[PDB]
Amino acid sequence: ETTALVCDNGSGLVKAGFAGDDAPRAVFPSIVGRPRHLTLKYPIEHGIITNWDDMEKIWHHTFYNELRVAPEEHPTLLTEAPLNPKANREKMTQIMFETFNVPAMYVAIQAVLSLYASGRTTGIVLDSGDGVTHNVPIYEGYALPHAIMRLDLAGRDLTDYLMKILTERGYSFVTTAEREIVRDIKEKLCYVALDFENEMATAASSSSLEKSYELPDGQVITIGNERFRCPETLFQPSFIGMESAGIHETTYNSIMKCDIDIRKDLYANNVMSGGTTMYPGIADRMQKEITALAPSTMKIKIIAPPERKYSVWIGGSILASLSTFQQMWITKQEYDEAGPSIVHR
Amino acid sequence: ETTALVCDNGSGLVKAGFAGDDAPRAVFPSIVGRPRHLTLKYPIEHGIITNWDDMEKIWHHTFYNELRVAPEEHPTLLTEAPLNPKANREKMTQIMFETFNVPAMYVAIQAVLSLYASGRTTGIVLDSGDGVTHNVPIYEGYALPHAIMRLDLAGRDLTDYLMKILTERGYSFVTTAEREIVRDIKEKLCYVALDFENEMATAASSSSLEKSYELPDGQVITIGNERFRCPETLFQPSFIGMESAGIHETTYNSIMKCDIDIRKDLYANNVMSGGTTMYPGIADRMQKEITALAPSTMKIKIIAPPERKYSVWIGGSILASLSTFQQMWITKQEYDEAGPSIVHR
Numbered sequence: 081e082t083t084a085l086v087c088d089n090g091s092g093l094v095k096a097g098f099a100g101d102d103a104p105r106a107v108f109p110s111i112v113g114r115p116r117h118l119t120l121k122y123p124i125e126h127g128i129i130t131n132w133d134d135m136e137k138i139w140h141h142t143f144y145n146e147l148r149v150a151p152e153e154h155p156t157l158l159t160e161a162p163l164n165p166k167a168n169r170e171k172m173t174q175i176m177f178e179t180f181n182v183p184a185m186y187v188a189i190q191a192v193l194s195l196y197a198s199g200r201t202t203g204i205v206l207d208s209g210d211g212v213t214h215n216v217p218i219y220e221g222y223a224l225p226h227a228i229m230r231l232d233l234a235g236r237d238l239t240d241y242l243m244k245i246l247t248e249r250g251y252s253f254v255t256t257a258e259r260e261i262v263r264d265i266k267e268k269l270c271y272v273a274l275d276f277e278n279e280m281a282t283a284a285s286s287s288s289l290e291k292s293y294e295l296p297d298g299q300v301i302t303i304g305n306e307r308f309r310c311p312e313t314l315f316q317p318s319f320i321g322m323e324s325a326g327i328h329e330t331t332y333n334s335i336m337k338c339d340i341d342i343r344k345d346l347y348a349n350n351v352m353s354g355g356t357t358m359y360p361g362i363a364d365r366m367q368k369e370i371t372a373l374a375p376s377t378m379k380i381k382i383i384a385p386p387e388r389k390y391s392v393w394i395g396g397s398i399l400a401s402l403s404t405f406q407q408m409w410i411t412k413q414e415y416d417e418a419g420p421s422i423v424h425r
Numbered sequence: 426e427t428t429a430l431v432c433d434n435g436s437g438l439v440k441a442g443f444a445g446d447d448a449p450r451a452v453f454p455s456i457v458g459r460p461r462h463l464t465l466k467y468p469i470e471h472g473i474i475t476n477w478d479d480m481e482k483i484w485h486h487t488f489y490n491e492l493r494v495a496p497e498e499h500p501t502l503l504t505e506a507p508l509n510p511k512a513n514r515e516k517m518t519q520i521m522f523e524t525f526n527v528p529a530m531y532v533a534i535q536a537v538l539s540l541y542a543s544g545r546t547t548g549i550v551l552d553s554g555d556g557v558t559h560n561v562p563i564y565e566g567y568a569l570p571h572a573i574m575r576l577d578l579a580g581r582d583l584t585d586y587l588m589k590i591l592t593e594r595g596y597s598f599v600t601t602a603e604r605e606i607v608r609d610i611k612e613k614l615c616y617v618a619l620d621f622e623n624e625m626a627t628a629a630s631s632s633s634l635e636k637s638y639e640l641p642d643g644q645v646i647t648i649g650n651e652r653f654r655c656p657e658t659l660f661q662p663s664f665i666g667m668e669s670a671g672i673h674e675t676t677y678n679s680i681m682k683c684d685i686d687i688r689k690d691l692y693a694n695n696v697m698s699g700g701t702t703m704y705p706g707i708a709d710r711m712q713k714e715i716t717a718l719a720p721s722t723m724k725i726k727i728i729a730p731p732e733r734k735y736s737v738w739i740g741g742s743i744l745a746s747l748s749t750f751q752q753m754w755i756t757k758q759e760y761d762e763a764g765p766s767i768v769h770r
């Protein structure tokens with residue numbers, strides 16, 4: 081009766097802890113600091129692990145520094161982005177079994193876990209983090225891969241934009257340290273307008289939408305239409321020069337690519353996952369926009385769990401603990417025996 | 426548990442004492458007197474040791490005459506000017522280990538120690554003494570060498586100028602003894618004008634800025650705009666026929682040569698070191714001038730420690746005593762073993 085580990089590796093944050101817990105004990109940056117003779121590196125670009133040696137370092141820091149546990153004494157549940165290439169998943173397995181000597185392991189799809197966290201086996205998930213946005217449709221637990229929509233625009237991109245659009249008010253946020261200041265602003269004051277034009281007009285004509293922000297040094301600053309113009313990019317990505325359709329449109333597209341029988345259920349089950357879905361008013365805006373694109377008689381529902389910055393991790397805590405999941409693990413025996421081509425079944 | 430020595434060799438003064446002390450016990454002229462059959466020699470020109478046999482004499486006078494200690498019984502911390510040539514540093518090491526038989530030693534950068542004395546690991550230092558003026562930017566303890574600005578104009582040059590500009594009032598300061606009298610005037614009455622033209626006008630139209638000076642022989646003399654015209658040379662070196670940009674401009678230039686990420690911090694951390702930064706009102710003038718050249722939204726701060734004539738020495742007292750510095754010493758064993766090429770790492 082040993083304890084299972086759940087480690088959710090995202091582009092910005094690593095979320096880690098023990099299965100069965102309500103929340104992860106460790107939440108820290110997915111970064112590997114390097115010198116010029118910091119110079120940070122984000123090992124995971126757009127939800128995909130791009131540098132493996134750096135990634136080994138984060139896992140090493142997860143077990144020994146953060147969780148303070150022995151890797152070979154706990155079965156480990158890792159998480160991956162939707163449509164992660166085969167070879168990527170095999171490499172994770174190779175590293176855990178050989179370099180960390182884990183007794184058992186399994187790699188789960190992030191969007192699916194989020195759904196599970198909402199108590200659902202079927203629905204369409206909007207998972208938008210720091211590095212990538214996905215629309216993942218799911219039926220009876222299985223993610224339909226031909227219907228998944230990806231969008232390389234998330235929190236970091238929204239932070240970069242807000243830095244830009246604060247410069248036109250006269251402020252000067254350009255450094256990496258100053259960027260973390262803007263990220264805080266984004267997380268504290270930004271919201272999604274129910275109707276952009278109206279909202280731009282309310283900002284143009286009055287000061288009712290202005291808020292004060294106390295900087296580290298003690299000075300206070302004012303921000304206006306930026307509050308909703310920043311997260312608006314989600315609905316209109318051409319603000320930052322991207323022709324990609326908005327999140328609401330890709331949600332519609334994700335649903336239309338699916339079998340007709342399941343769409344009614346998908347529409348009825350729009351779960352939101354990830355930190356970039358935490359903007360106040362994002363739930364009302366998605367309802368509105370989804371209604372416009374859909375047929376008139378469709379019942380639309382957008383589920384937005386309050387703890388949705390950690391829905392994935394939670395999904396894995398719940399899964400790792402389930403009785404029906406224990407059979408699906410990969411023992412070190414199975415791996416050494418069967419090999420990398422066993423993590424597909 | 427033997428006591429460590431700290432010896433700061435400057436162009437004008439030698440500052441020496443035991444690590445852990447608040448202030449150095451010995452402060453004396455960096456001069457070697459010679460005859461015509463005095464004729465003084467300053468062994469250190471512009472912060473660089475130029476005559477080694479004379480320099481041996483000052484170190485001999487430091488240990489035996491001034492500090493009254495045995496060189497081979499104390500690890501010795503020497504100081505050097507920014508961008509001191511490799512070969513210069515190797516020669517210091519050779520002399521301490523072979524001629525003074527020191528058990529351990531280390532050579533530190535003056536501007537960096539000053540910073541440490543202010544309780545900072547990062548910032549931009551204005552170190553202006555009797556022979557040289559440097560702008561030294563520093564990040565996480567390391568002095569960025571490509572961003573250091575040098576300026577061969579300090580206290581002695583300001584003293585030579587004041588002797589010149591007192592002649593146009595009718596006084597006759599020309600001899601070496603009389604020069605030390607002018608240096609005293611410079612140190613007692615000179616200040617830096619917040620605005621030169623205004624100040625020249627206040628001197629032209631009234632006598633509110635005049636001060637009396639009691640000479641050695643008992644007679645009193647009056648000095649006016651010279652009080653601020655002398656130190657003004659720092660901000661406008663073309664007063665003494667030098668095309669070099671002023672201290673405020675080189676401070677700006679030193680910052681712009683650095684990586685963009687660190688400039689905000691550099692501006693926020695302008696520490697002043699050396700006797701030529703002791704002019705009353707030099708802190709207000711640097712704030713003013715630095716603001717004009719910088720962007721409008723930049724927070725500028727000029728730190729001016731009251732004990733800043735001995736900031737370097739103090740920096741070394743603090744460093745020599747640190748726990749993390751003990752590993753960085755150079756034992757006589759290491760030197761005799763490894764050789765001169767070990768003092769670079």
Ligand SMILES: Nc1ncnc2c1ncn2[C@@H]1O[C@H](COP(=O)(O)OP(=O)(O)NP(=O)(O)O)[C@@H](O)[C@H]1O
Pocket residue numbers: 089090091092093094126127208209210211212213234235236263266267268353354355356357358359389
């Ligand atoms: N209240 C908030 N409002 C808006 N954005 C937020 C809020 N809280 C967190 N974020 C953003 O959420 C992002 C991190 O969330 P997370 O879902 O953990 O991303 P990730 O998993 O690290 N990377 P990815 O693989 O793209 O999910 C950052 O861009 C945060 O700034």
Ligand SMILES: Nc1ncnc2c1ncn2[C@@H]1O[C@H](COP(=O)(O)OP(=O)(O)NP(=O)(O)O)[C@@H](O)[C@H]1O
Pocket residue numbers: 434435436437438439471472553554555556557558579580581608611612613698699700701702703704734
């Ligand atoms: N109150 C003062 N006002 C102006 N100048 C001063 C004052 N006190 C000392 N000085 C000058 O400070 C200089 C000596 O300071 P110091 O920083 O010890 O120079 P140094 O280290 O001997 N030579 P360097 O290697 O150039 O620093 C002399 O030119 C003094 O006249």
Ligand SMILES: C/C1=C/C(=O)O[C@@H]2C[C@@H](CC[C@H](C)/C=C\C=C\CC1)O[C@@](O)([C@@H]1CSC(=O)N1)C2
Pocket residue numbers: 092093108109110111120210235236239256257259260263
């Ligand atoms: C509370 C918090 C949340 C977070 O998500 O940080 C992550 C990680 C962070 C790493 C680089 C910074 C300097 C190091 C320190 C961080 C502490 C964690 C900060 O880079 C992000 O900020 C990026 C860049 S700017 C943005 O919008 N996303 C996301």
Ligand SMILES: C/C1=C/C(=O)O[C@@H]2C[C@@H](CC[C@H](C)/C=C\C=C\CC1)O[C@@](O)([C@@H]1CSC(=O)N1)C2
Pocket residue numbers: 437438453454455456465555580581584601602604605608
């Ligand atoms: C209190 C004091 C401070 C000092 O800094 O002296 C140093 C050393 C001094 C050496 C020559 C004189 C005669 C010898 C005696 C000195 C006693 C120390 C005098 O030559 C300076 O004066 C030069 C020349 S004139 C000037 O402006 N810098 C700087």
Ligand SMILES: [Ca+2]
Pocket residue numbers: 089090091190209354392
């Ligand atoms: Ca994620």
Ligand SMILES: [Ca+2]
Pocket residue numbers: 316317318322323324325
């Ligand atoms: Ca568009």
Ligand SMILES: [Ca+2]
Pocket residue numbers: 434435436535554699737
């Ligand atoms: Ca000096």
Ligand SMILES: [Ca+2]
Pocket residue numbers: 661662663667668669670
């Ligand atoms: Ca000039």
